[PDB]
Design a protein around this ligand. Structure first.
Ligand SMILES: CCCCCCCCCCCCCCCCCC(=O)OC[C@H](COP(=O)([O-])OCC(O)COP(=O)([O-])OC[C@@H](COC(=O)CCCCCCCCCCCCCCCCC)OC(=O)CCCCCCCCCCCCCCCCC)OC(=O)CCCCCCCCCCCCCCCCC
Ligand SMILES: CCCCCCCCCCCCCCCCC[C@@H](O)O[C@H](CO[C@H](O)CCCCCCCCCCCCCCC)COP(=O)(O)OCC[N+](C)(C)C
Ligand SMILES: CCCCCCCC/C=C\CCCCCCCC(=O)OC[C@H](COP(=O)(O)OCCN)OC(=O)CCCCCCC/C=C\CCCCCCCC
Ligand SMILES: CCCCCCCC/C=C\CCCCCCCC(=O)O[C@H](COC(=O)CCCCCCC/C=C/CCCCCCCC)COP(=O)(O)OCCN
Ligand code: SF4
Ligand code: SF4
Ligand code: SF4
Lengths: 210, 144, 70, 156, 176, 56, 303
C-alpha cells in the first residue's frame, strides 16, 4: 500500500523504526455518523479491502446483536461459506505479495488466476467483484443463483493442487527459508501485551481462535 | 504428434480465406483461431464460438472495419458491440440474439453508438431546470 | 502457447549466427580460400614472413610447391 | 507537398512508438490497486500490450492514480508527478480519484486528484473492473494516436 | 483441535545426514523448483484476447446507470426521491413538479458518477424499476465534466441499453 | 485442455504430478449461463393466522 | 575488410540484446501462465523497436547539479567494455586471436566496475551512493572466485588461448571433468551481472541496459565455450557456429528460468555465500586441479 517509514540505522542493522500512518485517513468513522445503518454498511467493504465480506459480517453481527434479532439458518451458512472464500482470497493475497516483495513473483500470477475465479463468485452473487455489500444486518441481500454451488464445488476441488505448487515453490526453498526463518521473533507474552491477534498470536504457540 | 499440429496450423491458414485473410485476422486481432459463425451484426461485427476452448476464450467477435463514422480497421474498442451481442458476448446468457432476439420497442435505439468521448459529439452537462426567480421589468414609458 | 516464444528466439539466434559465420568467410576471402594463419611464439611468424618473401607477390598465403623448385 | 508528408509520417511513427510501449508507475493508494494488479494477472496480461508492470518513476510514461488521495498524501503525489519525464500522462481510476467518491464530504480527502495534477483519462467505477481499466488504457492509447506534434511545429 | 506446522525433528543417522548434505551440496530443492516452473511453462496460458474476448459477467452485474420507461414509451420515474434518500454517496440530485398533463415527473435527475460508489442501492430502493444500473462498464471519459450525468444523458442510456437491461431484469427479478 | 501426449508427459514429469486430472482452466464442466427460474420459499412469518407481530 | 568484420560483430550483438528483452518477457510470461508482448508486431516482434524509439524520444532528466562529465562517461565505458569483451571469443575463429585472451576478458570484466562507481558518484545522492557501493563490493567479491575458478579450469587446457579450449574438448566436454567448478562459475556469473537472485540494485538508461544484457549474453557464450565444447570441423565451421549459438541461447534462457524461479538474497547473505562457501571450495578444488594432471601424467602440451 502507501506507507511512510522513518528509521535510524547503524550500518546494516536497524536501530529504530517509526512508521508514519494517516496517508489513507478518509475519516470513515465520522462519515458513518451521518448515514443510516444500511447506508453505513458499504464503508466496511472499503475498510479492509482484501477481505470485503468478512468486514461486512462483523458489522452485520454487531447490528444484529443491538437489534435483538437473528439471521435464518440458510443466511448463516451462506455467510460462513463466503467468509471462508474470503479467507482464501486474503491468504492468497498476503502470501503472494509477501513472496513478491521478497522477489519470487511467479506464484502471484499463479494464484491471482484463482483470485479472479473467486471474484467471479462474488460477482454472481451480488453483481460486484469486490465490494459486494451482500451481507446485510438482517441476513444476505439475495439468494444464491441456481448454479452457483456446483461451480464453487468445481473450483474448490482443484485448489489443493494450487496450494501444493505454492508450497513446492516456497516451503523447502533455502533462499525463502533464509529470508524468513528467525525473522521478527515475538514471544507469547509480548504478543498478548502488544494487542496482537490472529496468526501473529498462533505463530508464537498461543492456542486461540475466535 | 508434430505432423498433426502442423496440419491444424495449415487448416487454420486455409480456413481464413487464404493467405490474405490469415494476415488480415493476424494483424487485426492477433489471433488466427477458427470457430463456427454464430451471427452477423448490422454494423458488420461477426461473432464466433468454439466450445472446446476454455471459458473466456470460447466466444469472440471480429469487429467491423467501418462503424458509424470512423474507419475501424485498426481503431477498435469494446464499446462497438450492440447490447444484444454485448449480453451474449459477456456470457450473461447462453442464447445468441439470433435464436431469440430482444423485445422490440418504439423508443429503443435503432443505431448503436460507441463511446463518443473526445469527439465533437461528446456529452456536455447542463442544468435542465428553469430560472427560479424572474426579475422585474421596468416600463418603457417615461415617468415625468 | 509456448511455441510463440520461438519466433523471437529464432530472430535472436539468427543474429548470433552472423558474427562467427562472417568471420569465417572473411578469413577465407583475405586468406585465399584457407583458414587465417595463426602466429604464436614467433617461429610461426618467421614462417609467415618467409612465405611472404618467397611468394613474389608480397602475400604469405600464395603457396609455392615443387613447381617452383626448378 | 513532401514537407508536410514527411512530418506526417514521422509523427505517425513517433506516436506508434510512444503508445505501443506505455510504462506506468501506479499509485496504489487504496483498493483500486487490487483491480490494477488483477489487470496484470494472467487473465488480462497488461504486459502483452507493451504496458510493463511497475515501472520506476524516472522511466515512467503514465501515472495511474488508483485510490483515495488524502490531504496528507497530495504533496507526495505532486512531487512524484513533477519528477516524471515528458511526455507524461495521468489516468484517474475509480470514484475516489475521479471526484472524491464515498469520502467526498470529508475533512481529509482531496475531492478529485485533478485538483493536484492534470488528468487525461477518467475510469469510473468503485472499483472499475480490470477490464474497464484495460478499456481506459486502450482509450489513452487511441488518444495518443490522435495527437500530432510535428504538424503543429511545421505549421507554426 | 489444533495442528503443529513446524514441530518436526530431523533424524540424526548417517544416511539422513548424508541426504541433507547432498541437498546442500548438489542443490536438489532448487532444481525441484526449477522443474515446477518448467512444467508450468508447458501449459496453456490463462490470457483472454481482449477486446475481442470479454470476461464473464452475470445478470446481477452493476454497470452504468439508466432511466427506463414503460412499453408505451412513458418514463417510469415518478419523482418519489427514494433513490436520492438511500444513496450512501449523495450522488443523486432530483427536482420535480407537475407536468403539463399533471403527471408527477422529475425536471432534474442528476447522478454524479465521480461520487457514485456503484452499490446499486438506488435500483433496489426504486418501487417502479425506473432507475437501474445497467451492464455497461466501458464508458471511460477524457474530461471530468462528462461523468456528471443529467436526465437527458440517463434517459439516453436507458433507450440505448433497454434490450439488454430488460433481458437482465427478466433473468434476475425472481431472486428479488 | 489439448496438448500432445509428449508435452503432457514432459510437464507431468517436471512438475511431479498429474496435470490433466486437475486443470487450472475451466471447460464445459461448468454450469450453464442460462438457468431455469427459481422459486425461493417464504419464511416462518408468512402465516395467515396466529401471526401477531407483538409475539415476534 | 577488417572494418566490415568489426561491424558484423558489433551490429548483430546489439540486435540480439534488443530481442533478448522480447524473449525474456515471453518466457517469463509463459512461466507465469500468461503471454508476453503479442500485440506490437506479429508475435511481439516489433516490441523491441517500439521500446527503443520511445526511449530515444523521451526527455532526459539530467540531475542539473551532478558531474556532467562522469554522467556522460559512465554509459560510454559500460557499452564499450560490453562490446569489447566479444572480440576474444572464438566462434570457431576469433576476430582477434589473442595469446592471453582469457586474461584479457578478465581484465575487461574487472574494469566493468568503474561504470557502477561513477554512476553512483554522479547521482548526487547518499542513498544511490550506498547502493553503488553495495554493487561494487558484490562485483569485486565474485570476480575473485571467477578468476580462481577460471585458472583452475585452464590448468587442463595448457594456456590462456581460447581457441585451444576447442582442442581440449575435442572428445568430451569439460563439464564432466569438473562440474563443481562449473556450478560455482555459473552462480558467480549470475552474481557478476547483477541478475536474480542477486539483483539487489531515457537514453543513458537504455545504454546501461544494453551493456548489462550484452554482458549477460557474452558471459553465457563464454560459459558455453569454457565448459560445453562443440566439435569443430575445419572445412565447415558453420556447424560449430550453430552448436555454440544453440548452447549460448540455452544458457541465457536458463538465466531467465532462474530469475523466474527464486526469491532474492539479502546483501549479507550473498556475501556470506561467497566468502564462506565458494571461496573455501574454490581453493580446495584449485589445489585438487593443480595436483591432478601431475598425479595422472596428463599435463596439456603448450608451454
Ligand atoms: C517445436 C517445433 C515447432 C512445432 C511445435 O512447436 O509444436 C508444439 C506442439 C505443442 O503442443 P502442446 O502445446 O503441448 O498442445 C497444445 C496443442 O498443440 C495446440 O495446438 P493448436 O491447435 O493451437 O495448433 C496451432 C498450430 C498453428 O499455430 C500457428 O500457426 C501460430 C504459431 C506458429 C509458431 C511457428 O500450431 C502450429 O502449427 C505451430 C507449431 C509450432 C511451430 C513452430 O507439440 C509439439 O510439437 C511437442 C514436441 C516436443 C517439443 C519439446
Ligand atoms: C535503418 C535506419 C533506422 C533509423 C531509425 C528508424 C526506426 C526503425 C524503423 C522501423 C519502424 C517500425 C514501424 C512499425 C509500424 C507498424 C505497426 C502497425 O501494425 O500499426 C498499425 C498501423 O497504424 C499506423 O498506420 C502505423 C503508423 C506507423 C508509421 C507509418 C510510416 C512511418 C515511416 C517513417 C520512417 C522514417 C524515419 C525518418 C527519420 C529516421 C495499427 O496498429 P495499432 O493501432 O498500433 O494496434 C491496435 C491494436 N489492434 C490492431 C490489435 C486492434
Ligand atoms: C583496453 C585494453 C587495451 C589492450 C588490449 C589488448 C592486449 C593484448 O593482449 O593484445 C595486444 C595485441 C596482441 O597481444 P598478444 O596476446 O600477445 O598476441 C599478439 C602476439 N602474437 O597487440 C597489441 O599490443 C595491440 C595494442 C598495443 C598498443 C595499444 C594497447 C592498448 C592501449 C590502451 C590505451 C587506453 C588507456 C586509457 C585509460 C584506460 C582506462 C579504462
Ligand atoms: C575422489 C576425488 C574427487 C574430487 C573432489 C570432488 C568432490 C565434490 C563433492 C562436492 C562438490 C559440490 C560443490 C558444488 C557447489 C557447492 C556450493 C554450495 O553448496 O553452496 C551452497 C549454496 O549454493 C546455493 O544455494 C546457490 C544457489 C543460487 C541460486 C541459483 C540457482 C541455480 C540452480 C539451478 C542449476 C544451476 C546449474 C549450474 C551448472 C551450470 C553449468 C554451466 C551452500 O550454501 P547454504 O546451503 O546456504 O549453507 C552454507 C552454510 N552452511
Ligand atoms: S474508488 Fe471505490 S473501489 Fe476504489 S478504493 Fe475508493 S471506494 Fe474502493
Ligand atoms: S449505485 Fe449507490 S451510490 Fe450510485 S447512485 Fe445508486 S445508490 Fe447512489
Ligand atoms: S428513479 Fe425510482 S426511486 Fe428514484 S425518484 Fe424515480 S421513481 Fe423514485
Amino acid at each position: 500500500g502507501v506507507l511512510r517509514l522513518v528509521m535510524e540505522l547503524s550500518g546494516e542493522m536497524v536501530r529504530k523504526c517509526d512508521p508514519h500512518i494517516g496517508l489513507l485517513h478518509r475519516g470513515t468513522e465520522k462519515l458513518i455518523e451521518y448515514k443510516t445503518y444500511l447506508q453505513a454498511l458499504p464503508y466496511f467493504d472499503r475498510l479492509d479491502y482484501v477481505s470485503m465480506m468478512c468486514n461486512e459480517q462483523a458489522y452485520s453481527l454487531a447490528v444484529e446483536k443491538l437489534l435483538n434479532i437473528q439471521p435464518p439458518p440458510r443466511a448463516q451458512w451462506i455467510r460462513v461459506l463466503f467468509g471462508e472464500i474470503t479467507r482464501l482470497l486474503n491468504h492468497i493475497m498476503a502470501v503472494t505479495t509477501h513472496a513478491l516483495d521478497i522477489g519470487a513473483m511467479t506464484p502471484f500470477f499463479w494464484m491471482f488466476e484463482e483470485r479472479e475465479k473467486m471474484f467471479e463468485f462474488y460477482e454472481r452473487v451480488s453483481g460486484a467483484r469486490m465490494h459486494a455489500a451482500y451481507i446485510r444486518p438482517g441476513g444476505v441481500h439475495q439468494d444464491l443463483p441456481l448454479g452457483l454451488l456446483d461451480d464453487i464445488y468445481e473450483f474448490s476441488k482443484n485448489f489443493s493442487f494450487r496450494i501444493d505448487e505454492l508450497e513446492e515453490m516456497l516451503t523447502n526453498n533455502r533462499i525463502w527459508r533464509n529470508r524468513t526463518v528467525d525473522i521478527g521473533v515475538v514471544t507469547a507474552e509480548d504478543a498478548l501485551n502488544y494487542g496482537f491477534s490472529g496468526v501473529m498470536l498462533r505463530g508464537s504457540g498461543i492456542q486461540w481462535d475466535l | 504428434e508434430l505432423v498433426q499440429v502442423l496440419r491444424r496450423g495449415l487448416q487454420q491458414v486455409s480456413g481464413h480465406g487464404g493467405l490474405r485473410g490469415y494476415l488480415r485476422v493476424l494483424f487485426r486481432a492477433n489471433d488466427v483461431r477458427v470457430g463456427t459463425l454464430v451471427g452477423e451484426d448490422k454494423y458488420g461485427n461477426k461473432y464466433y464460438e468454439d466450445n472446446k476452448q476454455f471459458f473466456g476464450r470460447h466466444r469472440w467477435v471480429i469487429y467491423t472495419t467501418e462503424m458509424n463514422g470512423r474507419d475501424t480497421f485498426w481503431d477498435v474498442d469494446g464499446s462497438m458491440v450492440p447490447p444484444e451481442w454485448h449480453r451474449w458476448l459477456h456470457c450473461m446468457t447462453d442464447d445468441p440474439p439470433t435464436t431469440k432476439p430482444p423485445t422490440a420497442r418504439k423508443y429503443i435505439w435503432t443505431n448503436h453508438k460507441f463511446n463518443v468521448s473526445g469527439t465533437p459529439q461528446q456529452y456536455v452537462p447542463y442544468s435542465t431546470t428553469r430560472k427560479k426567480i424572474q426579475e422585474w421589468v421596468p416600463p418603457s414609458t417615461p415617468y415625468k | 502457447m509456448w511455441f510463440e516464444i520461438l519466433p523471437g528466439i529464432a530472430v535472436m539466434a539468427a543474429c548470433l549466427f552472423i558474427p562467427g559465420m562472417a568471420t569465417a568467410h572473411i578469413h577465407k576471402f583475405t586468406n585465399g580460400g584457407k583458414e587465417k594463419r595463426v602466429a604464436h611464439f614467433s617461429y610461426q611468424w618467421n614462417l609467415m614472413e618467409r612465405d611472404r618473401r618467397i611468394s613474389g607477390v608480397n602475400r604469405y598465403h600464395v603457396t609455392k610447391g615443387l613447381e617452383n623448385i626448378d | 507537398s513532401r514537407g508536410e508528408y514527411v512530418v506526417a509520417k514521422l509523427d505517425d511513427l513517433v506516436n506508434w512508438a510512444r503508445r505501443s510501449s506505455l510504462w506506468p508507475m501506479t499509485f496504489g493508494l487504496a483498493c483500486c490497486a487490487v483491480e490494477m494488479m488483477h489487470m496484470a494477472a494472467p487473465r488480462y496480461d497488461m504486459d502483452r500490450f507493451g504496458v510493463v508492470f511497475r515501472a520506476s518513476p524516472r522511466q515512467s510514461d503514465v501515472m495511474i492514480v488508483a485510490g483515495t488521495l488524502t490531504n496528507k498524501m497530495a504533496p507526495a503525489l505532486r512531487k512524484v508527478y513533477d519528477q516524471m519525464p515528458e511526455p507524461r500522462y495521468v489516468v484517474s481510476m475509480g470514484s475516489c480519484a475521479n471526484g472524491g467518491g464515498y469520502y467526498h464530504y470529508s475533512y481529509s480527502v482531496v475531492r478529485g486528484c485533478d485538483r493536484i495534477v492534470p488528468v487525461d483519462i477518467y475510469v469510473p467505477g468503485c472499483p472499475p473492473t480490470a477490464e474497464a481499466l484495460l478499456y481506459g488504457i486502450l482509450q489513452l492509447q487511441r488518444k495518443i494516436k490522435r495527437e500530432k506534434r510535428l504538424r503543429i511545429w511545421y505549421r507554426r | 483441535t489444533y495442528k503443529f506446522v513446524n514441530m518436526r525433528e530431523p533424524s540424526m543417522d548417517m544416511k539422513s545426514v548424508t541426504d541433507r548434505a547432498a541437498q546442500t551440496l548438489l542443490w536438489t530443492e532448487l532444481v525441484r523448483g526449477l522443474g515446477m516452473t518448467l512444467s508450468y511453462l508447458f501449459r496453456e496460458p490463462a490470457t483472454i484476447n481482449y477486446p475481442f474476448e470479454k470476461g464473464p459477467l452475470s445478470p446481477r452485474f452493476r454497470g452504468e446507470h439508466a432511466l427506463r420507461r414503460y412499453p408505451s414509451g412513458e418514463e417510469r420515474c415518478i419523482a418519489c426521491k427514494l433513490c436520492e434518500a438511500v444513496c450512501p454517496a449523495q450522488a443523486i440530485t432530483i427536482e420535480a413538479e407537475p407536468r403539463a398533463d399533471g403527471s408527477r415527473r422529475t425536471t432534474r435527475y442528476d447522478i454524479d458518477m465521480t461520487k457514485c460508489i456503484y452499490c446499486g442501492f438506488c435500483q433496489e430502493a426504486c418501487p417502479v424499476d425506473a432507475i437501474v444500473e445497467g451492464p455497461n462498464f466501458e464508458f471511460s471519459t477524457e474530461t471530468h465534466e462528462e461523468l456528471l450525468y443529467n436526465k437527458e444523458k440517463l434517459l439516453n442510456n436507458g433507450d440505448k441499453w433497454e434490450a439488454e437491461i430488460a433481458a437482465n431484469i427478466q433473468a434476475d427479478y425472481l431472486y428479488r | 485442455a489439448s496438448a500432445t501426449r509428449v508435452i503432457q508427459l514432459l510437464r507431468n514429469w517436471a512438475s511431479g504430478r498429474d496435470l490433466q486430472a486437475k486443470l487450472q482452466l475451466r471447460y464445459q464442466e461448468i454450469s450453464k449461463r442460462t438457468q431455469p427460474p427459481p422459486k425461493l420459499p417464504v419464511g416462518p412469518s408468512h402465516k395467515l393466522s396466529n401471526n401477531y407481530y407483538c409475539t415476534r | 575488410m577488417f572494418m566490415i568484420n568489426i561491424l558484423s560483430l558489433i551490429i548483430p550483438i546489439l540486435l540480439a540484446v534488443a530481442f533478448l528483452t522480447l524473449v525474456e518477457r515471453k518466457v517469463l510470461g509463459y512461466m507465469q501462465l500468461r503471454k508476453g508482448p503479442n500485440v506490437v508486431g506479429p508475435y511481439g516482434l516489433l516490441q523491441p523497436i517500439a521500446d527503443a524509439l520511445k526511449l530515444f524520444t523521451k526527455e532526459p532528466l539530467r540531475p542539473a547539479t551532478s558531474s556532467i562529465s562522469m554522467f556522460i562517461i559512465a554509459p560510454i565505458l559500460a557499452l564499450s567494455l560490453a562490446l569489447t569483451m566479444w572480440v576474444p571469443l572464438p566462434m570457431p575463429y576469433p576476430l582477434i586471436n589473442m595469446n592471453l585472451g582469457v586474461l584479457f576478458m578478465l581484465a575487461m570484466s574487472s574494469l566493468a566496475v568503474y561504470s557502477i562507481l561513477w554512476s553512483g558518484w554522479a547521482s548526487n545522492s547518499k542513498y544511490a551512493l550506498i547502493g553503488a557501493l553495495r554493487a561494487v563490493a558484490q562485483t569485486i567479491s565474485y570476480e575473485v572466485t571467477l578468476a580462481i575458478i577460471l585458472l583452475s579450469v585452464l590448468l587442463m587446457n595448457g594456456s590462456y588461448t581460447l581457441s585451444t579450449l576447442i582442442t581440449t574438448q575435442e572428445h568430451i566436454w569439460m563439464i564432466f571433468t569438473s562440474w563443481p567448478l562449473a556450478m560455482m562459475w555459473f552462480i558467480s556469473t549470475l552474481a557478476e551481472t547483477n541478475r536474480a537472485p542477486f539483483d539487489l540494485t531515457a537514453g543513458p538508461f537504455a545504454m546501461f541496459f544494453m551493456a548489462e544484457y550484452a554482458n549477460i549474453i557474452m558471459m553465457n557464450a563464454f560459459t558455453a565455450i569454457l565448459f560445453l565444447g562443440a566439435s569443430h570441423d575445419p572445412h565447415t565451421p558453420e556447424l560449430y557456429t550453430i552448436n555454440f549459438v544453440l548452447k549460448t541461447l540455452a544458457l541465457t534462457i536458463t538465466f531467465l528460468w532462474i530469475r523466474a524461479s527464486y526469491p532474492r538474497f539479502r546483501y549479507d547473505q550473498l556475501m556470506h555465500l561467497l566468502w564462506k562457501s565458494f571461496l573455501p571450495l574454490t581453493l580446495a578444488l584449485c589445489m585438487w586441479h593443480i595436483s591432478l594432471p601431475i598425479m595422472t601424467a596428463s599435463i596439456p602440451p603448450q608451454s
